[PDB]
């Protein structure tokens, strides 16, 4: 079942708008890749030279980017996302080449065997796929054939995954707590390493796949001998879960980080000698060693914050301030939909408050650090408009989702919607038309209209067609629909319930409210538009019941309307009356009175 969504944002989001899940460092180009919870992958220059380390954004994913792996000497990036896909990128030019769709839930982890250019992917669906990288990059629009290889045995959701450099061993970590080991060449099961009492989010193998390091939410790091199939050491240097591991080339020192924010370098042969490298400002999600020199000179660190810190390594914390800092942006952490179902108030991590227009897909004004709830109450308007969208803050930006069940639920008058009133508009229907305004197939004359005639969304707006619960089907920017590739993919992906409105120019159904009308202090059965104003009922009564210049005026002068014993405002619509005043059950009941 297909939903339409779109993201309200600027054309360029230079900075991460949420935390960072994974990191990759290209030593030949001095480039750092960050995989964002904001769904964007970004390339940075790590020269302490440049004042602006930003290089490019890599934009295709629909949800958290959980993992990335640089392959083929920095030529190729492979990404894993909560949108259930694995994507193949040209890492030099920064564009998406292929999308693998074999996963059925969040893809959580990637693994890489450099000597075979072999990668593997794993996620919450308990599947592990193995991919030859040169086979994936060779994919074209004609050579469209792909074949798979997978591992079985995982009884639970996979959170981590590692291969050795030789591609002879692969291990997964999961909420099953057990580590599962296979031969990636044959997919044969090798062993089960038992010992952890919680999830395992961090795994490393030495180069010839004879030892393994696991970091676990039980707070321990464990060293494993694969020849003995057992744990040969347990290190307890953290207070909470270990989420991230790095190791030196000699597989003799382990760098660890996790929820307690502390980062340690521990000697594996002699645990008691360990060094507190730093305490980060937020739980550590991933770390990437600078490997310019043996004793690595620095470590890059990803946290739940949008900023990314490089910490220097020259040996009570070793470091107190990061050595380099890649700046991040604010996340939208709180959201309020106003009663007009048209505007939104936000608060972000900097405690800045903004006011937005969902319909025009844009910001209206920045309000700075005013009180958020006092600001809500200040903009309160007594009006009811049926719910017609949903908002989510998972990327740290505003993402709006439309569903067939209620997308067309909200008819409002053009005047109350703030448009020229020289006339009833359906909000969801106007938006769909703005989102698909550049799609030529929508350029239709109902006996030529392009767009909806009241507003546009910004041309750079991402428009997403996905399945409820997970799978993105197709994503483009609003302005790109006229493309030949885009029009083809739209025809294949746009559900008939959107076509109905955007192509056929068909009106959605109206909504009516049944109500009773009876004297205050003879019960009639009526029905009217949910947007009908109280005045019209007053006129009704004046004309056809208590009926002993303008009629609206005389009606207003003679007839008083009540609901739940409150005198009603002639400008209020039935919808609003029922929502704010009708406090009873069964049909709305209005009482009429001679003034």
């Amino acid at each position: 079942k297909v939903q339409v969504s779109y993201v309200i944002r600027d054309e360029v989001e230079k900075y991460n708008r949420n935390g960072v899940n994974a990191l990759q460092l290209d030593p030949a180009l001095n480039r750092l890749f960050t995989a964002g919870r904001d769904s964007i992958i970004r390339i940075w220059s790590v020269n302490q030279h440049k004042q602006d380390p930003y290089i490019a954004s890599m934009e295709h994913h629909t949800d958290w980017v959980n993992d990335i792996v640089l392959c083929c000497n920095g030529k190729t990036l492979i990404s894993a996302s909560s949108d259930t896909t694995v994507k193949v990128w040209n890492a030099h030019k920064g564009f998406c080449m292929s999308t693998l769709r074999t996963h059925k839930d969040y893809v959580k982890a990637l693994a890489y065997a450099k000597d075979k250019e072999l990668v593997a992917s794993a996620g919450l669906d308990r599947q592990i796929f193995l991919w030859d990288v040169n086979t994936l990059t060779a994919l074209t629009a004609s050579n469209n054939t792909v074949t798979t290889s997978s591992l079985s045995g995982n009884k639970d959701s996979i959170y981590s995954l590692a291969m050795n450099q030789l591609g002879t061993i692969i291990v997964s970590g999961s909420t099953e707590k057990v580590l599962r080991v296979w031969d990636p060449r044959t997919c044969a099961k090798l062993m089960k390493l038992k010992g952890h009492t919680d999830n395992v989010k961090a795994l490393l193998l030495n180069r010839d796949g004879t030892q393994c390091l696991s970091g676990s939410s039980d707070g321990t790091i464990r060293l494993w001998s694969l020849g003995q199939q057992r744990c040969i050491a347990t290190y307890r240097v953290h207070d909470e879960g270990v989420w991230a591991l790095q190791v030196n080339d000699a597989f003799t020192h382990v760098y660890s980080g996790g929820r307690d924010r502390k980062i340690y370098c521990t000697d594996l042969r002699n645990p008691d000698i360990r060094v507190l490298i730093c305490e980060e400002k937020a739980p550590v999600l991933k770390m990437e060693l600078d490997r310019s020199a043996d004793p690595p000179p620095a470590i890059w660190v990803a946290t739940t914050k949008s900023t990314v810190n490089k910490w220097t390594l020259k040996g009570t914390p070793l470091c107190t301030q990061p050595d380099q800092v890649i700046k991040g942006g604010a996340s939208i952490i709180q959201c309020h939909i106003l009663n007009d179902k048209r505007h939104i108030l936000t608060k972000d991590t900097n405690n800045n408050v903004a006011y937005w227009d969902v319909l025009k897909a844009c910001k209206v004004e920045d309000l700075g650090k005013v009180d958020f709830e006092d600001e809500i109450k200040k903009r309160f308007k007594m009006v009811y408009v049926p719910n017609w969208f949903s908002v989510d803050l998972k990327t740290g930006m505003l993402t709006i989702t439309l569903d067939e069940s209620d997308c067309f639920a909200a008819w409002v008058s053009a005047k109350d919607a703030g448009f020229s009133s020289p006339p009833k508009l359906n909000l969801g229907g106007l938006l769909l038309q703005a989102l698909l305004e550049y799609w030529p197939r929508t350029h239709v004359n109902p006996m030529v209209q392009k767009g909806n005639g009241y507003f546009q969304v910004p041309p750079h707006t991402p428009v997403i067609f996905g399945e409820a619960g997970g799978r993105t089907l197709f994503r483009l920017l609003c302005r790109d629909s006229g493309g030949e590739t885009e029009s083809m993919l739209l025809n294949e992906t746009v559900p008939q319930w959107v076509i109905d409105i955007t192509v056929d120019k068909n009106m959605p159904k109206f909504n009516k409210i049944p109500f009773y009308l009876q004297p205050h202090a003879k019960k009639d059965r009526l029905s009217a538009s949910d947007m009908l104003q109280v005045r019209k009922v007053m006129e009704h009564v004046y004309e056809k019941i208590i009926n002993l210049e303008d009629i609206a005026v005389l009606a207003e002068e003679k007839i008083e309307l009540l609901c739940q014993d409150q005198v009603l405002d002639p400008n209020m619509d039935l919808r609003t009356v029922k929502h704010f005043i009708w406090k009873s059950g069964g049909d709305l009941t209005l009482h009429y009175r001679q003034k």
Binding site: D63, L124, E240, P283, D392, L393, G469
Partner: protein
């Protein structure tokens, strides 16, 4: 036309409840409640016809209806149903992404669990993984994530009405000892197989209600001879 459920089940619940002395005393000293009152008066002044004097699971329906009755005629004027049966449980939910634990307390008149009875109630129970199409919305992650849900009892009731959907005569919750006083069970075999039965504590021996006949049975004929529609019910009174 409304269905209260299986006849024998409902009768067995009613019988078990009569041998919850504090519930018995307070109804005797007292709708659905007035009928329950008259029925218990009769018994104190035929078992198969108990429910007739009066399908959602009957016990929970019954206690809550009395709770609502007593809460309402309290409003016009700690209802006694609450002081006898009300306990408090806590539902822990742990996001597996941020590993933050959030807690929510809930009142209960009866308690369902899906290890041992003693190990359950003393530790955690009803462990459940939220995943796939039913992930947890985490307020820390602001998105759907996998979660581990589990239940711990916060406040033990005077009488613990336990739904199991191997039972000990005494329960040690150390700080509180509980004695088994009633059982509602659907026997697989034994001379009472076929339908729901009530087994109750009376003074210092055990009675068994089967259809219309009350019969004494020896202690530990109980766990020597006792597959179900609504599981089985254990009533524990604290000492």
């Amino acid at each position: 036309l409304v269905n209260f459920g299986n006849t024998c089940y409902c009768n067995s619940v009613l019988q078990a409840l009569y041998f919850c002395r504090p519930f018995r005393e307070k109804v005797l000293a007292y709708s659905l409640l007035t009928c329950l009152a008259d029925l218990f008066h009769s018994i104190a002044t035929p078992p198969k016809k108990f429910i007739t004097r009066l399908a959602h699971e009957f016990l929970n329906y019954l206690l809550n209806t009395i709770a609502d009755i007593l809460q309402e005629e309290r409003k016009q004027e700690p209802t006694w149903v609450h002081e006898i049966f009300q306990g408090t449980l806590t539902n822990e939910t742990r996001c597996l992404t941020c590993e933050t634990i959030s807690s929510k307390d809930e009142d209960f008149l009866d308690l369902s669990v899906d290890t041992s009875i003693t190990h359950c109630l003393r530790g955690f129970s009803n462990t459940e993984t939220l995943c796939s199409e039913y992930k947890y919305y985490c307020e820390e992650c602001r998105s759907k994530q996998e979660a581990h849900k589990r239940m711990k009892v916060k406040k033990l009731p005077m009488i613990l009405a336990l739904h199991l959907k191997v039972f000990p005569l005494e329960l040690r919750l150390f700080d509180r000892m509980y004695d088994l006083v009633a059982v509602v069970v659907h026997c697989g075999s034994g001379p009472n197989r076929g339908h729901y039965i009530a087994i109750v504590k009376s003074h210092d021996f055990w009675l068994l209600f089967d259809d219309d006949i009350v019969e004494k049975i020896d202690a530990q004929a109980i766990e020597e001879f006792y597959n179900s529609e609504s599981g089985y019910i254990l009533f524990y009174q604290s000492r």
